Design an enzyme around this catalytic site. Sequence first.
Site, PDB file in Angstrom:
ATOM      1  CG  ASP A   1      43.453 -17.463  22.765  1.00  0.00           C
ATOM      2  OD1 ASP A   1      42.037 -17.709  22.637  1.00  0.00           O
ATOM      3  OD2 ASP A   1      43.985 -16.693  21.952  1.00  0.00           O
TER       4      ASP A   1
ATOM      5  CG  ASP B   1      38.358 -16.989  21.911  1.00  0.00           C
ATOM      6  OD1 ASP B   1      39.272 -17.637  22.798  1.00  0.00           O
ATOM      7  OD2 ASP B   1      38.728 -15.971  21.238  1.00  0.00           O
TER       8      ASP B   1
END
Lengths: 349, 349
Positions: free
Chosen positions: A59, A241
């Site tokens: 992430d 992201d």
Amino acid sequence: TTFKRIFLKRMPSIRESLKERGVDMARLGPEILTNYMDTQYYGEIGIGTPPQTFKVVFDTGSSNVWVPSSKCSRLYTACVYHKLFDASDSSSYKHNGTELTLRYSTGTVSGFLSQDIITVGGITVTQMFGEVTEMPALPFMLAEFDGVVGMGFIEQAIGRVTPIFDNIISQGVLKEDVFSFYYNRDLGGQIVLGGSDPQHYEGNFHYINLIKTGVWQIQMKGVSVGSSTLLCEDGCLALVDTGASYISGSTSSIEKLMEALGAKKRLFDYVVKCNEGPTLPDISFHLGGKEYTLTSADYVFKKLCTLAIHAMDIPPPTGPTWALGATFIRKFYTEFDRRNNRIGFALAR
Amino acid sequence: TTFKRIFLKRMPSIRESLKERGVDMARLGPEILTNYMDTQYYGEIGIGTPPQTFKVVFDTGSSNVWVPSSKCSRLYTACVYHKLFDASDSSSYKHNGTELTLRYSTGTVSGFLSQDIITVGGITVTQMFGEVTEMPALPFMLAEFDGVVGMGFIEQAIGRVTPIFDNIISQGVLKEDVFSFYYNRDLGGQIVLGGSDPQHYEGNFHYINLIKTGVWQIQMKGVSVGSSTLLCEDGCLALVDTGASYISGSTSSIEKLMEALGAKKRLFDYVVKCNEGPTLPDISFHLGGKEYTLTSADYVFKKLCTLAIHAMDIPPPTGPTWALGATFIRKFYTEFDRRNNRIGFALAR
Ligand SMILES: *[C@@H]1O[C@H](CO[C@@H]2O[C@@H](C)[C@@H](O)[C@@H](O)[C@@H]2O)[C@@H](O[C@@H]2O[C@H](CO)[C@@H](O[C@@H]3O[C@H](CO)[C@@H](O)[C@H](O)[C@@H]3O)[C@H](O)[C@H]2NC(C)=O)[C@H](O)[C@H]1NC(C)=O
Ligand SMILES: *[C@@H]1O[C@H](CO[C@@H]2O[C@@H](C)[C@@H](O)[C@@H](O)[C@@H]2O)[C@@H](O[C@@H]2O[C@H](CO)[C@@H](O[C@@H]3O[C@H](CO)[C@@H](O)[C@H](O)[C@@H]3O)[C@H](O)[C@H]2NC(C)=O)[C@H](O)[C@H]1NC(C)=O
């Protein structure tokens, strides 16, 4: 030469598995944030000597590494339904024990700090990570992943803890201080550490410098629907992201986008009739020098056809911003250039 | 003629899905009882006008019908992660609201009573069932099934509530007051209401009268290993339980069985080397007139090969007893004869 690679494998999203079950989505709750609710890809890492392997999502929107602890208090905590890191099986383990408190919108994850060799993508980083002893039942008990690996910056690290990638740079050898993400149009997915795989892109990369110290965020000059620019006329932000699966913007902006598309709203998502779908126009994001287009096929999947765009009013530190999630990256191979603090895009293949 | 049928579909056991995840089984808790922890089959039912459909296991070991309620208190209860019965969508719904309290070894399920038409296996029974408002997080949040349908007797019904089958008999027409279970050697499985499917058995049925008023339990005359009887010399009980997946006995008796087999114990299950498996002798259960044999292939699945036999010290009301679960029924097509209060077996095909 031979690359340094982390393969990403497909897993059912905790939302997906709820649909397979047949859950009413509206009857859930309203849901320092990234749910991973629609996250559908993970890689594996080792932690310690003998490597204790864990399924983790990578992430770029967060800067901590955490896995479940062997010290989860039995049935009480609901983390015990995943793989647990037993420190008593690692010779390289080093105590720390400073309490850590990651807050999520669904609940508060608690645990302590620990140091150990992490095996990842064919190499050993000595990392300091979180051993979680309390977990939110809602998302995590359905999770197919065991933990999280931050690819973000120290600024967005709880405890000012050095991110696995910083540590990768400072200690030991990568060719170049970068990493890239790639998703197949579909076990499909790949991160490369220290390079970009030429087999999975074509043409040339184009770069946009990060606009602020410690986040994978960049300036976007305009969002174009069809041929004409609709919103982000005076400039807005775009957070790249890897932990997010869809594109997202401020509700203000997302209302506008969908009106022009003629996609009537469902309280859950935005939907269109499956016949009318293919007709939907191209969307194009104005980032740096080039225009990054997404055709109907790229963001669409008798009357039931949901899109890959959502709304997320992100709080004011990272600020009102958009979020280029996995759906963007699937069409546009992405390189995270920490050496030059920029992000670069190319067409995927 | 055309039969009355409930098809049984395969689902991952909540234990299985934990192994797929990679959970340490020993680090769980020690686990008015049937866990359904290793239950791998379900059918669907309707409840109400328009039928609200639910995935349910059919359990001859219990006598209640319960599904999750629309009135689960949001995220708090952990039942909201399944299909919920909304009474406001049923015209046939009739209020009751008497509190119900089903106790399990892992936790206490709470809810209230409700009356409604149940559609099952191509027919409508007006049933009174439980609407559950509190659920144990441990087993049920992993469950692929939504609820339970008792096929037991009123005596073992919490609240003295008439079991769906009693109601089937008393109201409306089945040909004969019986039902049978059948599992494929493998979407495979079938209950028939009011008959036995001749296509899924061969030879003739043989019957054993139930030894006591209100339970699907019968007298077993001996358990034979190889050629000679080992335990249950003076007679023991055998509970035919469709909700159980394996054969089980008292720990006293199960120790003996496995010693003769030469299957060394794992603290979790009983295991044998995969080479040595096929060699393992035949087990045969002495029920009524005939001897019911299970070969190595029937109860077995380099050194990792687990068996389909377990230990369960069942409390003293139903008494020390064995439990012929799904594994027995897979080889031996079973008929539950409520009209004559007996159970009948035949070879499956
Ligand atoms: C848990 O770990 C944290 C973070 O530790 C740091 O990184 C590790 C991988 C190791 O390399 C550690 O050696 C390293 O400290 C610990 O906290 C840190 O404690 C040190 C002192 O031990 C602090 O350093 C001070 O710095 C000032 C100047 O700024 C000096 O004047 C002091 O004399 C002293 O050297 C440091 O500030 C602090 N860092 C943070 C982020 O809090 C923590 O102690 C540790 N807990 C344990 C082992 O129980
Ligand atoms: C919830 O439902 C239970 C069970 O109800 C019974 O089955 C239903 C499907 C319907 O057919 C109901 O009509 C039926 O009662 C309820 O409890 C029962 O209440 C009745 C009275 O309403 C009790 O009957 C009594 O029987 C004695 C003799 O034994 C008479 O002297 C009395 O005058 C009276 O008729 C019955 O014992 C009782 N049954 C049980 C198992 O408790 C319950 O009232 C109901 N709650 C509601 C609707 O709020």
